[PDB]
Design a protein around this ligand. Sequence first.
Ligand SMILES: O[C@H]1C[C@H]2CC[C@@H](C1)N2Cc1ccccc1
Length: 330
Amino acid sequence: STGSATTTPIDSLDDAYITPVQIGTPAQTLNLDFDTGSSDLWVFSSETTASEVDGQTIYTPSKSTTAKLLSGATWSISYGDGSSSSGDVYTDTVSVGGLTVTGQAVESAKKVSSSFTEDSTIDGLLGLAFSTLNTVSPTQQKTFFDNAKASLDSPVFTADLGYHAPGTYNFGFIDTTAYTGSITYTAVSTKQGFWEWTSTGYAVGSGTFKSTSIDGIADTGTTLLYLPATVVSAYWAQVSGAKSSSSVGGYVFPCSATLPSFTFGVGSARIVIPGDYIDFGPISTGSSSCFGGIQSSAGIGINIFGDVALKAAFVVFNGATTPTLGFASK
Ligand SMILES: O[C@H]1C[C@H]2CC[C@@H](C1)N2Cc1ccccc1
């Protein structure tokens, strides 16, 4: 089997991408944030505290003839940015882009944090990291991809995120028309539960490539590119007037600037992020200070190749017995 679904930016900045997901019988379609940095499929629901729902579409398990309470199971997740949610668990039929999994754990939120409530476009998350990170207790549950894998034509999914435009998540096949050149594959460590890999270096604009190992994660659920402070300083030094602002929370730059590209290495291959992908717009409406799309990871503990980086590539998440990542230009 295969599946193919379009993923759409939630706003004009590409802050996140939403993909329609069919849950239950008859289908209830919710727009979920596909997140290769986490491993829970959770949704706003009829059980979510009413004051914490503001415009999201909810899953109502009592209206699904295939929903079953997973008795005794609870979940609770804290993300890298401090956002959180928790609740109980149903199993139900879940379909993405024509690919159907029966008995998928659908984690129903009883509580969500302010960033989730404020995101009226996001009805939940669909985790695509390794199932070892799934938070369901006392019986850990598998991700949608893990449940689908054995049925797929090939045990892979691909992320093709658009710049200020829709893109595609495919399951079970690699669309050879969706990228240019060749796909370069690179080793993955699953030791932390992430799609963790080592970039071979970087360049700023037309500058020389610096060969240096940068361990990080491929994370579709993170908006920006978070890299070591040395790398980030080297980038922003090429933008007149750019500076790190403690009050804003990262590097800002004059909105009048033209940003240089940023290149990262995948083995001997190179992925070029155009400068415009690094502009996240005014820090507040009407401001001439703009927020940068490349930020320091120093306070995180891990480097994160988020959407800024991934949207410059066609990315293969190869879930074979020994997983690997592939990157192609497009
Ligand atoms: O306060 C709420 C949560 C965040 C921050 C501002 C706005 C509403 N949301 C933008 C956003 C959505 C998805 C990913 C990244 C950023």
